[PDB]
Design a protein around this nucleic acid. Sequence first.
DNA 1: CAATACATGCAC
DNA 2: GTGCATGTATTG
DNA 3: GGGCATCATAG
DNA 4: CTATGATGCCC
Lengths: 470, 468, 246, 242
Amino acid sequence: GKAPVDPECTAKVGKAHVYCEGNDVYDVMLNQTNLQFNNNKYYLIQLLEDDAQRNFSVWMRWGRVGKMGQHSLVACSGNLNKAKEIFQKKFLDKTKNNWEDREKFEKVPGKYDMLQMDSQLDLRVQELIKLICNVQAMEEMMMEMKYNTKKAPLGKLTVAQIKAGYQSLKKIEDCIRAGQHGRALMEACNEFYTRIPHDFGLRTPPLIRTQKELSEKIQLLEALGDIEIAIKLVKTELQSPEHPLDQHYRNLHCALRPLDHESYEFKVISQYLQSTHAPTHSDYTMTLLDLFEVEKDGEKEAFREDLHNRMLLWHGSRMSNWVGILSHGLRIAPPEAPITGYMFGKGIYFADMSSKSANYCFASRLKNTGLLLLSEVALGQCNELLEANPKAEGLLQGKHSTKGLGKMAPSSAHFVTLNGSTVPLGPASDTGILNPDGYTLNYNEYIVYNPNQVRMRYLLKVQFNFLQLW
Amino acid sequence: APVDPECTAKVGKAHVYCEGNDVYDVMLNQTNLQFNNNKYYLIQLLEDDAQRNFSVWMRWGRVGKMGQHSLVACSGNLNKAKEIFQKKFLDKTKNNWEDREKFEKVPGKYDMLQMDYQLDLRVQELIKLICNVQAMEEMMMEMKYNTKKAPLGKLTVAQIKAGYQSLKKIEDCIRAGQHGRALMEACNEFYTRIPHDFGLRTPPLIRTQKELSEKIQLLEALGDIEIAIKLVKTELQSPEHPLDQHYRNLHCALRPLDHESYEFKVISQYLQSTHAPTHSDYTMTLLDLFEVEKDGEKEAFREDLHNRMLLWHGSRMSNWVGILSHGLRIAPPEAPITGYMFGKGIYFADMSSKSANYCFASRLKNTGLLLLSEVALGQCNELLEANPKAEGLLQGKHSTKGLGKMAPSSAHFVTLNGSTVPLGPASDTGILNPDGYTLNYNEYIVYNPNQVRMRYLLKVQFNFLQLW
Amino acid sequence: RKEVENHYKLSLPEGLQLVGPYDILAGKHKTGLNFNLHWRFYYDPPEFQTIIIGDNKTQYHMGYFRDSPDEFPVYVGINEAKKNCIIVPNGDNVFAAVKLFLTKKEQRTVKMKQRDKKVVTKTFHGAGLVVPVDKNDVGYRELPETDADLKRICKTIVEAASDEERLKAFAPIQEMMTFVQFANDECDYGMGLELGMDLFCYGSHYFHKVAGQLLPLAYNLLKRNLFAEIIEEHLANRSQENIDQL
Amino acid sequence: LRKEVENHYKLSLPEGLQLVGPYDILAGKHKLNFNLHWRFYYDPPEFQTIIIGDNKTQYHMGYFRDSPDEFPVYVGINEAKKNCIIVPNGDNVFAAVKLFLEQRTVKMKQRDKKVVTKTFHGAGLVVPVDKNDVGYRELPETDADLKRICKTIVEAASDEERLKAFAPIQEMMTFVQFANDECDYGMGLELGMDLFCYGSHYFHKVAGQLLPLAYNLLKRNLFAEIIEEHLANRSQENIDQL
DNA sequence: CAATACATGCAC
DNA sequence: GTGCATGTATTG
DNA sequence: GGGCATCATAG
DNA sequence: CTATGATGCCC
């Protein structure tokens, strides 16, 4: 990505720039951790040359990862060769590798590891894009996942580092699948925590022992990847834009139509809205402010219209990430990402009760505007699931979708129709599924695997309306 | 007020902050031989000349070894800087900074220290030799980076006195023959007050008198450096020759003598006749002889005392300017008495080459100075063996002689201005020792400075020989 | 016995004053009377059924502690309601409780050691949460925040100088509630149990409804409706004077 | 017939190889500088070589006397082509040849209790001192920095850099003079021994100004004669029978 | 060394 | 008695 | 022989 | 963390 100067060199952040030369840019960040004997350390190095004066310098900074640490400014009066030698020496001291082949990096045990870093429009559509495409709010979200929720201590990482994270998580998944609590598990966790930055304060970094904790790591890592794609998307554009959110919409490139209240569609979906507010989500109600028609190019032929059991299903997600989705649609669990973290296997997840998926919108009392998506999904023959099982994909044998069977759900007698799709209108009722072997899910859920088996059709503008606070 | 060079980005751009008495500069030293600590910490508040920005410079490491530093700039928040400064000071000391005068070190914390941060060609030749400020700085760097005895820098006279106090305590301690725990704390106190670099090794216990005595010689060199750099201070008021004001600072008439005079001949002959045979790696040539006229000694000199002899004294090239300004000085009361093998006072020889060894002439620097002084031994006490308690042994006597095996005999003695000149050659004096060793050569030590009258200074080419 | 335990709706096992059921045993109950509020102090959770009041200055008190309305007391707990929210165990029977006070002026048995083996997190009261646990551990997930930082969040919420500053400080709690409803969506109810219990324990009124949005529901999710009744009526009446005859 | 041997040697002797030195008189092969007889380039006068081995490393064994008036305190071995180190190798010629085929007695451990300094050869100095320990003082410099001084002087490219680099040695000689004035002769003994150990010709006169004088001060004039003649003739051919 | 955080006795 | 800073340990 | 990499220690 | 070194193990 673009290479800024670390602000920590306050006497030189404004009069100097990090030195670059093609491929090899003399800047590197190393992380090391050893939970066995309690090492948890970072080391950033940046070679800075002044813009005005001919003088090269190496800046080094160290401490616990997360906790900002001691720095050093080594000036050379323009003797760049010695300074680069010093750079390389310090690099080998910490890595046992030559610096110039930083691309072909191979970490060695008992040494630091490297890491790799980075106006004509409707007012309602303007509010939606400003909701999703505002660079400020994305910046605020990244700041929240670093100093509010200490999830990204050093900073950001690369897409390939994300992939390496997924790869390492896969190895962890293999490890935990063997349930042995010896040395290799600890070193694999070290491998994880080196590639994926954490901040643990005083205590020894804990063993990541259950699949739930893995899943938390999964949510984190996907959230990071989402941050990368979100910040990549909001890249500004020249050639007379006059309102950058419109080029952001071009980057979305998705037909989105405002709907009137007087339409049959608005009335039936508001009926559906009210009927499918789960009563155990009673801290709020949901009001339909607007409903937006979704037309993502290419899905029409690609949609599995051939498959029966077509229903309109919810998908809720945070205020910010829709900008990726509206440009790119929903995606299934990454191949590298372990399958066993997802309680009903990988794929794309949809609900039949608006409020459950609507919980994923992360609406607030101060920020009362949220979005819900409805997608038409042709489930075909469903596999019926009583209990969580990540191995759901194998049990198909020709099948195309799975239903995870909850206690409560709307009944097929109460269903309505919209544009040739079967609409599972609410309210939720008893489903009579019980389990004399394990538990039973509270509410049904639908899992699909092929992304082309989904056709996003309307986007719901949902004012999440919370109530009295004491 | 000099700026520490270590803050390279601001050594030319900033000056150390002070406020009257309290100057915001500090050096702290800590050492603990039990736990093998030897550490310093200097802090300096620097404000830039051009823009209003205050900064604290901190540096830490082994004493002697330039070390790890930190620069905290504040963009004119003087209050922040003072708070940070005093905070770090208390962190390292548990003492308040503002009353830096009333300092009391506490155990398990750093200690403070205090720093300083028309004439003839022959007589002009002499003063330029002794007043060479370049050479004085060369001596200073030679006793800071060549001989790493006072590594970090200079000290004040009173800090030196505190050094003497600690030396006194060490002397009393070793006088009690106990090398235990209190000895370790006292030595730690010593090495904190006096900067050392022992590298990796544990700082050693001062176990005999010898280590005491070398420290004494070190401290004398230190005091000489203090008084010398104070005295070689150049002066304005249109002098056109600063060495003339340096000569004023001597305030001691020094006259060139002709080689053909009787007295010059007998002194040169005296130089030759008393050339020790075991110092034959060099000879000594009388290049010239200088007349010495030190103000105030004439009324002060003890002419009343008998046994008046002409005695040698050699010393390094640099301190002569102080001596010609002040005369020789007697051992300070504070300084432990027991370091001087026959007690304190002024040291003279009757052996030209033995005293002449103390001049530090060189193969490259073949020129040395020797002073001859008339010293009235009075009733001199004869001493066979080293005993620093000789001052009690006078009881009416006036000077001590340490009795050497080889020495000139009185039959060959000559006269200079009615003073007895103990002319050589050296021969046996028939004194022997039935308990221990026997001194190679005599020495004379006086206690009353008034029993000394400097007569002539000898310009001597110490002529060394073949080298391989 | 049977009318007493019909009155309290709980099963009871076989200078201080005996209260609670002892009031009926003393016949002091003979004067609308909701015994779900009987001797419930300002900080008494529905799990804790107070049976003895002591020093009123510190509001030190002893009570039966039942983790669920269908079970026996798991211990006798003690708390000083004017002082703090910590519930300290006080023996496994009334004999143990009174001797603990008497010596102070077994406390944790092997079955209680099993309960501590079932303690998943202490949740500001130090006694721990118990959730029924399957092979895939559904029923609980841990909160994303530690105890000290949660205490910090409650601290910065309660010390905010205005309602807008309070709600602004409420934002991590709102997101924590969002994750709690997520856990509810995946049936990990013990998380909302922990959060709601902590909001109860802090004692500021500003958390009454939101915990009242979560903890009764969770107890509804836990099928512990008597506790839901207790917490609703208690949030309406968590008093500093708590005698049902007043 | 030992009397004529020791009259030739002026010293007292205690009661694939070739035996050399005083056994040569026992062999009668002398039918001549015996102060220098089989004295290798790095053999001090304290060390009188009596056995030669491999000439490639110039391995040799010899009696070692601390003073010319005593019996040898031990027998040492040294490789003159390898280093300046004299290695203790037994208490007599028989022990030494058995080792090459006791190394330290209780008497030698007492000498080690009297050992004051190693002086680059590692065998130790024993100096008589009085009750106030006068007879010895330490040098103000450690051995390794002296080795650096010797290396820097010998590697100097010109006469001026040698004269400038000689300055710590010159002033060390000045302090040696001071110690000699105060009867701490062992300082000059150590300085002369170390400069002898370094082997560069640039010190041969100046060590010859101090170290014999010290032996003169130590009343060890025979070793002073040996070192005079040796410094005059420290050759790589040293058999007087040629 | 800096810098943290955590058990602890001490001044408004 | 309550902030509050200190002293000790770890890591960096 | 020369040079850099475990252990170590102090700062 | 720097940083500097004893030491040792190696082309």
